[PDB]
C-alpha cells in the first residue's frame, strides 16, 4: 500500500517564530525518498528538500526536515517564516514499481497539502475604520494588530474580504488592512464589521 | 502561469512551459483544489506513446509534439470535472521532480456563465490622510467569472508593485451557487503629499481571461472574450 496523509488545517505562524509540518506515510517499499514542496499563490510548484530513507535527517537553508523512520513521519520546519513563506505545503513519496530499482517512469505520491500563512508582528498598532468615497462607496479597516481575527459579514447582502499585508518597501512599513462594502444604499461603516472581533480602541471619523 | 476556459465536450490545449535538459518522459499532474495532486499520465519520447493511469479512458489525454523541446497535452470530451492546475513534469539529474509553470483549467456547461469584471476605484478618506498621515486606496472588480483574473497597480504609465496588497482568492458574490461570479479587492497606499498632487494618475488595471476568436457565441450581450478593463482616479487637491 502506498499512501501520503498531511492532517493539519491551515496554520496561522508570526514571522520569525518556528512552524513545523506534519507528515506520514505507508509504504511496502525496502528503499524510499521524501519530497517537499511549496505551491505559491500564482500556482508555481516549487521543490524544497529531499529526505532519503537510509541518509540522514535533511537540512538545507531554512528548512529543515525531522525523519522518524519506524514511525514513518517526515516534518518539515520552517524556522526564519518570512511573508513571501506563505504557500500550500505538499509532502510527496517517491513510487516504485520495477523490483531493481527507482525509474523515470515512476511518479509521486502527493498529500491533501498544508497551507501556511504567516502573519506580521504589528509595531505600531492603529485600528481604525475608513469610509472611502467613490468616482461615480467601501469602508475600509485599516492599521490593526495581526493578532485580530476577521470574522466574516453574516448577511448576505454585505461582503467582507480577510486581513491583506501592505509594504512600502521605502518607508520600511508594513500593516493589515480589510474591505467591506454593500449594495445597500443606507449601509453605515459603523455597523458593517459587528460579527468579527475587534480592538476596544478602533478609531472612527466624525460622519459627514 | 496561464488560464484556460473551455465549454463541455469540447477539447483543450495544456502547454508545458518546462525546459528539460534531458528528455525521456515528461508526466502530466493534476490539482483539484481540497484535492491531492495526482499524475494522470506521461510521455514516452523515444517510443511517442501515452501511458495512462488505470481507471483512465483511452483517447481522453493525447499529448501533442509539434517542435523538438515541445509538448502539448490535448484534452477530450471536457467535463467541470477536468477543471483544475494541470502540470507538466519531469526528473532531473538531482533527482528532483521539476514542475513548469502551471496552467489553470475551468470547464462550464453553459458558456453564458462567464462575465468580465466591473472595475471601481475608490478615493482614500480624509480622516486616514489627516490621522495616519498616509492615503489609502482601494480598487474592486466585481461580476466576473471564471476565477483568473490579474490586477495590476499602474501609477503615472508605470507598474507599482510596492505599497500595494491583493487577496489571494476572490470571494463569491453568491456562495450558494457553484458557477457564481466572483469578486475581488486590491489596496494601493501612498503618502498623502503624493495622494494629494492632482498631476499624479493613479489606474487599477485588471487582466481577464475570456472566450475566443474561435468560441461561438450568439447572446444579445457583449462577448466575454478575453478583456483588459481598468479604472482610473486622479489625486485630490485636499
Known amino acids: 500500500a502506498q499512501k501520503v496523509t498531511q492532517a493539519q488545517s491551515s496554520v496561522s505562524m508570526p514571522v520569525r517564530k518556528a512552524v513545523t509540518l506534519n507528515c506520514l506515510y505507508e509504504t511496502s517499499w525496502w528503499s524510499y525518498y521524501i519530497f517537499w514542496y511549496k505551491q505559491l499563490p500564482s500556482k508555481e510548484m516549487i521543490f524544497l528538500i529531499r529526505?532519503?530513507?537510509?541518509?540522514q535527517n535533511a537540512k538545507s537553508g531554512r528548512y529543515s526536515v525531522n525523519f522518524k523512520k519506524a514511525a514513518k513521519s517526515v516534518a518539515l520546519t520552517i524556522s526564519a517564516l518570512q511573508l513571501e513563506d506563505s504557500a500550500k505545503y505538499f509532502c510527496?513519496?517517491?513510487?516504485?514499481?520495477?523490483?531493481?530499482?527507482?525509474?523515470?517512469?515512476?511518479?509521486?505520491?502527493f498529500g491533501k497539502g498544508t497551507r501556511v500563512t504567516v502573519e506580521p508582528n504589528i509595531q505600531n498598532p492603529d485600528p481604525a475604520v475608513y469610509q472611502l468615497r467613490d468616482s461615480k462607496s467601501v469602508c475600509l479597516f485599516t492599521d490593526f494588530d495581526s493578532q485580530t481575527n476577521v470574522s466574516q459579514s453574516k448577511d448576505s447582502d454585505v461582503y467582507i474580504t480577510d486581513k491583506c499585508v501592505l509594504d512600502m518597501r521605502s518607508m520600511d512599513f508594513k500593516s493589515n488592512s480589510a474591505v467591506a462594502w454593500s449594495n445597500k444604499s443606507d449601509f453605515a461603516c459603523a455597523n458593517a464589521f459587528n460579527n468579527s472581533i475587534i480592538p476596544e480602541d478602533t478609531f472612527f471619523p466624525s460622519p459627514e | 502561469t496561464k488560464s484556460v476556459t473551455r465549454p463541455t465536450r469540447s477539447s483543450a490545449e495544456i502547454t508545458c512551459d518546462l525546459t528539460?535538459?534531458?528528455?525521456?518522459?515528461i508526466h502530466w499532474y493534476l490539482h483539484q483544489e481540497g484535492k491531492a495532486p495526482q499524475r494522470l499520465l506521461y510521455?514516452?519520447?523515444?517510443?511517442?506513446?501515452?501511458?495512462?493511469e488505470s481507471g483512465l479512458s483511452p483517447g481522453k489525454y493525447y499529448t501533442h509534439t509539434p517542435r523538438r523541446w515541445s509538448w502539448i497535452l490535448i484534452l477530450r470530451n471536457l467535463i467541470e470535472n477536468d477543471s483544475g492546475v494541470y502540470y507538466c513534469?519531469?526528473?532531473?539529474?538531482?533527482?528532483?521532480?521539476?514542475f513548469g509553470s502551471g496552467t489553470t483549467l475551468v470547464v462550464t456547461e453553459d458558456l453564458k456563465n462567464v462575465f468580465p469584471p466591473e472595475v471601481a476605484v475608490f478615493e482614500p478618506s480624509e480622516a486616514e490622510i489627516s490621522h495616519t498621515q498616509k492615503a489609502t486606496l482601494v480598487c474592486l472588480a466585481t461580476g466576473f467569472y471564471p476565477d483568473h483574473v490579474e490586477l495590476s497597480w499602474w501609477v503615472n504609465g508605470k507598474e507599482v508593485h510596492s505599497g500595494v496588497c491583493t487577496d489571494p482568492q476572490p470571494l463569491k458574490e453568491q456562495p450558494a451557487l457553484n458557477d457564481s461570479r466572483y469578486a475581488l479587492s486590491s489596496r494601493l497606499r501612498v503618502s498623502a503629499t503624493f495622494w494629494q498632487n492632482p498631476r499624479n494618475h493613479f489606474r487599477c488595471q485588471v487582466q481577464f481571461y475570456g472566450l475566443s476568436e474561435n468560441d461561438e457565441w450568439t447572446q444579445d450581450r457583449a462577448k466575454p472574450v478575453t478583456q483588459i478593463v481598468s479604472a482610473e482616479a486622479w489625486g485630490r487637491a485636499d
Open positions: 528539460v535538459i534531458n528528455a525521456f518522459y
Open positions: 529526505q532519503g530513507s537510509d541518509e
Open positions: 510527496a513519496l517517491g513510487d516504485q514499481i520495477l523490483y531493481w530499482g527507482l525509474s523515470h517512469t515512476d511518479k509521486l505520491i
Open positions: 510521455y514516452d519520447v523515444s517510443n511517442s506513446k501515452d501511458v495512462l
Open positions: 513534469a519531469t526528473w532531473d539529474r538531482n533527482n528532483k521532480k521539476l
